[PDB]
Amino acid sequence: EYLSKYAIDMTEQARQGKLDPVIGREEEIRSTIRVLARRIKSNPCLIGEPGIGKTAIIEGVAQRIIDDDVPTILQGAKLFSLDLAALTAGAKYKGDFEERFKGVLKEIEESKTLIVLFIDEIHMLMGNGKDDAANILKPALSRGQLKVIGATTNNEYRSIVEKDGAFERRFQKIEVAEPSVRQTVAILRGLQPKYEIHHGVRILDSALVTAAQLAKRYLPYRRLPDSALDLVDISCAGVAVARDSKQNVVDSDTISETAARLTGIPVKKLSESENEKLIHMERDLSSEVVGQMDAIKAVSNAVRLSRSGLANPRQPASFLFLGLSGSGKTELAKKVAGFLFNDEDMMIRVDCSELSEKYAVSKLLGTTAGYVGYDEGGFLTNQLQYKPYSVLLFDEVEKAHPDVLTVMLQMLDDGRITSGQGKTIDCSNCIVIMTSNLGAEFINSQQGSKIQESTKNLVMGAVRQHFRPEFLNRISSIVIFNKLSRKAIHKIVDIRLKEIEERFEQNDKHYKLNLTQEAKDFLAKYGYSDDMGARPLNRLIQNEILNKLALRILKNEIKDKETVNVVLEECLEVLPNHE
Amino acid sequence: LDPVIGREEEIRSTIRVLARRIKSNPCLIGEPGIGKTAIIEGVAQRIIDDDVPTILQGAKLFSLDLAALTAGAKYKGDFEERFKGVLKEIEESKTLIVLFIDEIHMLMGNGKDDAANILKPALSRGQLKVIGATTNNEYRSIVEKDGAFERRFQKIEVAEPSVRQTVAILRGLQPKYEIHHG
Amino acid sequence: ISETAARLTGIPVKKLSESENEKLIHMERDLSSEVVGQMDAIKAVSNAVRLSRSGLANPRQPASFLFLGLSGSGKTELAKKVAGFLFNDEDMMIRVDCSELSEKYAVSKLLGTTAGYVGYDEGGFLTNQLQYKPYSVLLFDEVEKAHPDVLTVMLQMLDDGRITSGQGKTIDCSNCIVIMTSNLGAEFINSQQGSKIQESTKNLVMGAVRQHFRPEFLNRISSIVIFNKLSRKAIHKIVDIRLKEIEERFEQNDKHYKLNLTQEAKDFLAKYGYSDDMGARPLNRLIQNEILNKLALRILKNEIKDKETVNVVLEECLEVLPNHE
Ligand SMILES: Nc1ncnc2c1ncn2[C@@H]1O[C@H](COP(=O)(O)OP(=O)(O)OP(O)(O)=S)[C@@H](O)[C@H]1O
Ligand SMILES: Nc1ncnc2c1ncn2[C@@H]1O[C@H](COP(=O)(O)OP(=O)(O)OP(O)(O)=S)[C@@H](O)[C@H]1O
Ligand SMILES: Nc1ncnc2c1ncn2[C@@H]1O[C@H](COP(=O)(O)OP(=O)(O)OP(O)(O)=S)[C@@H](O)[C@H]1O
Ligand SMILES: Nc1ncnc2c1ncn2[C@@H]1O[C@H](COP(=O)(O)OP(=O)(O)OP(O)(O)=S)[C@@H](O)[C@H]1O
């Protein structure tokens, strides 16, 4: 009776059509059967990554028995799935759980046709460093009795073997593999009617294909038999939800949207409104960043290329921004994040300006087991796992120690980067921007505005002297920022003045600066340092205007709508009815 | 319970996952202090107002304590019994019962083992829907060790709401504070 | 018995199928159809694979290579195509990011950490992969960046396949292939004195190797292999290959080429992408810069839905099918 209380009759579940129909995996199913067909230690075990179909194989075998597709040894056999229930019943009256366990084995053992016992999470039976693990399945399997099928993960197997020894002897591992995308789809097709029936939705074959493809590309941490199903099942659920208050059909687009929600990857949304945003991306960035159109275009291409799906799945977009300091290198990256997340600071930043090798590698990746801290991934690993397509910005990669840059070297080509604790993170479908001021050395030759021939040669000469080709050749594009022209300065001043207004927390403490009057000319004239980019503008605005404004505010001379003009420098007005 | 403001996508996504045939176990993930458990209660409120997908229409949502795990361990195995009991009561399906586990990493177990089948193979059967809640750090401490949980549960990213959203939230909660403080 | 063992260990060596004979005696043919030129590297690998598959390989020496060459010459690529062949899946490869192998961590990262210390997740990458997939190809990217202490561990691994784990177990990764890559000789290959790396230049490369790795390691590699700089002719073939891969990776295959200019475009790219010291990488870049980016706009603008055509611009451009929908 024990067997009916502490285990599930998997062959009955197969008989009743409750188990997912099993598709493919013939070598694996066959191997399990062949091992069960053994006489001594007829004890197979399915080992492999958590999502590859281990119990599906077991269920498959249950079906093969029901379907009369087994050896005469197995024909007429019954398969049970052992629960922990026998053990959960309690260790009250010391050893009784072992007796119940033994009772299960005894019922099985006494020739009630051939009974095979299967155990989920079988590593649990390694018990208390042996001891409580008792004789669980030990003399049983040793004598070839009580045929057992076990299944667990790679890591658990490692723990079983390591800690027990004897179990390794008793069990015959069978490796189970993740199916290919094509195989995955075939499986999905096989499962399709169960999903369609459950949800009450129709699934197009295109959708099934789509899910497997997307799963391979966008759910790297979880194996295809699961990941593809999550996309199918969830997409179906999506449709099922629509059916609650609103065409019950799942297609590739539904899945792609679902994937975007699931993974955070915006590439899969596919909207007409997106198209307009991307088409005019350059305009929007040019209204934030003045000039530097080549840089704007360079990035825009990365985004558009990625959003179209054309970007190579293994080549994170990668840019190196060379250019004269203050030309807007960091600023561009921020504005790109602005565009992509509606948040200039959403991006992941790596302050490479601070990277002495000894520490630098570990700061980005973290430690291996056994070292101080296991809170791995200071910056790259931890951030990449939650914001997998975000903009990753490296400030002054030029100054990073040459060795830490080789972490980036790897990151930049074929996604993979691994944590200190051993996980592949894979910064794949994302954008990487790196910065350097190295090129300033030649740009400051004042060769007009747009970078000229020779200037660019020297800039690239220097970058070649500084970084090894191994790195440079992995960059999608090296962009050299242009010098800002006085004309650019006029545009910049406008933008800056607008940002100043927008950032005011107190919506009264703002200007009506006569920026249409000589005030803009003053700023453009005085702030145009040929070689400090736009930075002098921030300083002039503070020295010429905001500092004075602060005083006007402190003295309560200001309510709102402050105005500015120039005398002989910038001068602020007061509101005449004030002190 | 306090009302939930915004977070519509989170509520929708959570339920959508619960609507799944198998492994219908969403988990909220994000930095602490962002409203993860608020979302969970938001779902409870949608259930009370019944503004939910068919699968939840008349469903219950329970928050599991660790008392199930820890309230006495003489007669080792009793906590396992507590879980088989609880999980069985959920499986009973008097109505649809969804279980919420706060601090979901707490069921990881000391070197697993204790973890038993607490919410393990059962989740793949379509019953015992579980909603989790964790942080990036906790998540890593579960996932990198269990493997199977990473598969069983489906994380949902939960963003820090923007300042704009924050204000809306504050307005929404304003009367609770005004009433409490007077 | 042999077949049974193959089933249990996964090792194809023991299957002995006739169909393998053709794939193996022609492995070079097929690798050369993926990797252009670089025949010595191709032969080097194929010989190792064949010794294993034919049952001649010595169990105490995992096959190993040290591939030297210019970046963009196909070092990583070859290894992947080989893994592709061996498993019918390039993702089966076990990879090591050697650039991450700073002294204090690298050993423990690959082998694991000893009992008593935080985390017993031994095996990080090597033990954990090797204990399940015995004949996986290992790939070490830029081994010259690994701290010498790490390279020392490889020396141990490269004989008897014996590697100890952090917790004291052995791996015995006998029947496998180990690929190490390096850019140390790039400085001499860049002399461009030839097509096939020239003799003598070859010794300069050995010089770079000998001054970086200790001899104790170097004489242990089954063979040190040097990739050739790519020739212009190679580039023509490479371009063709990339264009095919590009079409193949279009998972949403409405987005596909007819390409057109089936000579002219390829020649344009071959001409412009033939950078003497950057291997094939510039070809990838030109295609994105000159073609795919433009395609992205044609897609975004609803100008092209399928049947993509490239024209020469006297650069290159794409022709609109639907009229800007
Ligand atoms: N070949 C297949 N045939 C039928 N169903 C499959 C197949 N592969 C996967 N599935 C489904 O997707 C899952 C595959 O993995 P499962 O066996 O459920 O999980 P697992 O691989 O057993 O890992 P554990 O041991 O349960 S953590 C199953 O739960 C099935 O629902
Ligand atoms: N081309 C530009 N358009 C608009 N604003 C700009 C531009 N260039 C610089 N700025 C201003 O420059 C400031 C930030 O410049 P950054 O990009 O940080 O300096 P940089 O160009 O990165 O040089 P480094 O490397 O950071 S010294 C912002 O306050 C911007 O307003
Ligand atoms: N969107 C929201 N609508 C209404 N109230 C909210 C919202 N977000 C947060 N709150 C309130 O803000 C508080 C913080 O939320 P919590 O869920 O406690 O934080 P948390 O994200 O759960 O952090 P942990 O993980 O539980 S420490 C909650 O107590 C809610 O009452
Ligand atoms: N001979 C070749 N035939 C075909 N493709 C090639 C060839 N050489 C290089 N490639 C391409 O180069 C890219 C992969 O880079 P690799 O050439 O392996 O870089 P590498 O040669 O490994 O130098 P490292 O060590 O990775 S910097 C792929 O896009 C390959 O297709």
Swiss-Prot record, chain A:
Domain of life from the UniProt record: Eukaryota
Region (NBD2): 250-440
Binding site for ATP 2: G323, L324, S325, G326, S327, G328, K329, T330
Keywords of this entry: Acetylation, ATP-binding, Chaperone, Coiled coil, Cytoplasm, Isopeptide bond, Nucleotide-binding, Nucleus, Phosphoprotein, Repeat, Stress response, Ubl conjugation
Induction: By heat stress dependent on the heat shock transcription factor HSF1 and the general stress transcription factors MSN2 and MSN4. Expressed at a higher level in respiring cells than in fermenting cells. Expressed in stationary phase cells and spores (at protein level).
Span(s) of short sequence motif Nuclear localization signal: 482-498
Modified-residue entries (Phosphoserine), positions: S42, S142
Region NBD1: start-end pairs: 3-246
Regulation: Inhibited by micromolar concentrations of guanidinium chloride. Inhibits the ATPase activity, but does not dissociate the hexameric protein.
Annotated localization: Cytoplasm; Nucleus
GO cellular component: cytoplasm; cytosol; nuclear periphery; nucleus; TRC complex
Covalent crosslink: Glycyl lysine isopeptide (Lys-Gly) (interchain with G-Cter in ubiquitin): K329
Annotated ATP 1 binding sites: G48, E49, P50, G51, I52, G53, K54, T55
Family label: Belongs to the ClpA/ClpB family.
Note: Present with 32800 molecules/cell in log phase SD medium.
Subunit text: Homohexamer, forming a ring with a central pore. The hexamer is stabilized by high protein concentrations and by ADP or ATP. Oligomerization influences ATP hydrolysis activity at NBD2. Interacts with YDJ1. Interacts (via C-terminal DDLD tetrapeptide) with CNS1, CPR7 and STI1 (via TPR repeats); under respiratory growth conditions.
Function per UniProt: Required, in concert with Hsp40 (YDJ1) and Hsp70 (SSA1) and small Hsps (HSP26), for the dissociation, resolubilization and refolding of aggregates of damaged proteins after heat or other environmental stresses. Extracts proteins from aggregates by unfolding and threading them in an ATP-dependent process through the axial channel of the protein hexamer, after which they can be refolded by components of the Hsp70/Hsp40 chaperone system. Substrate binding is ATP-dependent, and release of bound polypeptide is triggered by ATP hydrolysis.
Name of the protein in question: Heat shock protein 104
Organism whose genome encodes this protein: Saccharomyces cerevisiae (strain ATCC 204508 / S288c)
Gene behind the chain: HSP104
Curated annotation (Swiss-Prot), chain B:
Compartments where found: Cytoplasm; Nucleus
Result for mutant: D2 to K/W/Y: Impairs prion propagation
UniProt effect for mutating G35V: Completely abolishes ATP hydrolysis
Induction summary: By heat stress dependent on the heat shock transcription factor HSF1 and the general stress transcription factors MSN2 and MSN4. Expressed at a higher level in respiring cells than in fermenting cells. Expressed in stationary phase cells and spores (at protein level).
Effect of T135A: Reduces rate of ATP hydrolysis at NBD1 nearly 10-fold. No effect on oligomerization
Residue numbers binding ATP 1: G30, E31, P32, G33, I34, G35, K36, T37
Function: Required, in concert with Hsp40 (YDJ1) and Hsp70 (SSA1) and small Hsps (HSP26), for the dissociation, resolubilization and refolding of aggregates of damaged proteins after heat or other environmental stresses. Extracts proteins from aggregates by unfolding and threading them in an ATP-dependent process through the axial channel of the protein hexamer, after which they can be refolded by components of the Hsp70/Hsp40 chaperone system. Substrate binding is ATP-dependent, and release of bound polypeptide is triggered by ATP hydrolysis.
Other notes: Present with 32800 molecules/cell in log phase SD medium.
Comment block on domains: Has 2 AAA ATPase type nucleotide-binding domains (NBDs) per monomer, a low-affinity, high-turnover site (NBD1) and a high-affinity site (NBD2) with a 300-fold slower rate of hydrolysis. There is allosteric regulation between the 2 sites. ATP binding to NBD1 triggers binding of polypeptides and stimulates ATP hydrolysis at NBD2. Nucleotide binding to NBD2 is crucial for oligomerization. The C-terminal extension is involved in oligomerization.
UniProt name for this protein: Heat shock protein 104
Included stretch of the parent chain: 183 to 364 of 908
